[PDB]
Structure 1
Amino acid sequence: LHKEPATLIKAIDGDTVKLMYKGQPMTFRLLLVDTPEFNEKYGPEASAFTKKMVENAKKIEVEFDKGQRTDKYGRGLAYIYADGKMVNEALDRQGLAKVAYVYKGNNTHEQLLRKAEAQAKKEKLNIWS
């Protein structure tokens, strides 16, 4: 996989963010994770965590997997890095997201994210309280 530079437009919620990518606005849905909806428990906490992570990044990178690049709503499907730290993994590790929507094409970082989830689970963090 390869990391491509992108710039922030706006945070949306825990697992969705609007970036400029190749000079076009594009909403991105985070691969392999599901943060609670904003209107659910831990949703606000997930939204704030992702927002803080992307707004404080000097550098944002988009990393597509080997399968489909866009979902049925036209959102890019990617791993998103903020100063070299993967937002998908970070949410997982804090128990603000769970591993989800695991599809065969697009699962390069599955074991890593499950590893993160297991640690959050062990620590009974947030969602795993």
Structure 2
Amino acid sequence: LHKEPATLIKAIDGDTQKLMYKGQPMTFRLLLVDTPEFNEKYGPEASAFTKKMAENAKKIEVEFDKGQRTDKYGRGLAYIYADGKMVNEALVRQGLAKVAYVYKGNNTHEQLLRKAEAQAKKEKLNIWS
């Protein structure tokens, strides 16, 4: 997989954000994770965590997997990096997302993320508290 450049247009919630990619505005949905909706427990905390990570970053990058690059809603499906650190992994490591939506063909980072989930659950963080 390869990282490609993007810039933040605006935060949306824990697992979606509006980025500019190849010069066009797109909503991205983070691969392999599911944050709570803003109206659910830890939804606000997730939204804040992703908003902070993306807004503080000097460099945002998007990395597509081997499979579908857009979902049925027209959202881009990617791993997103904020100064080289993966947002998807970070959310999971903090107990603010669960590994979820693991579809064959787009699951390159599955075991990285499951290792993070195990550590979050071991620490009883957030969702696992």
Question: Could you tell me the percent identity over the aligned residues?
Answer: 98
Secondary structure of 2:12's partner? strand
In 1: Cα distance, 2:25 partner to 2:69 partner: 15
TM-score, normalised on structure 2? 1.00
Secondary structure of 1:73's partner? coil
Query: Deviations for 1:66-99, whole angstroms, at most 9, x for unmatched residues?
Result: 0000000000000000000000000000000000
In 1: Cα distance, 2:111 partner to 2:105 partner: 14
Query: Deviations for 1:91-113, whole angstroms, at most 9, x for unmatched residues?
Result: 00000000000000100000000
State the 1:11 CA deviation: 0.3
Secondary structure of 2:105's partner? helix
Query: Deviations for 1:31-76, whole angstroms, at most 9, x for unmatched residues?
Result: 0000000000000000000000000000000000000000000000
Alignment RMSD, CA only?
0.2
In 2: Cα distance, 1:74 partner to 1:21 partner: 14
Secondary structure of 1:102's partner? coil
State the 1:25 CA deviation: 0.1
In 1: Cα distance, 2:17 partner to 2:106 partner: 19
The runs of at least 4 aligned residues of structure 1 exceeding 6 Å deviation read none
TM-score, normalised on structure 1? 1.00
State the 1:18 CA deviation: 0.4
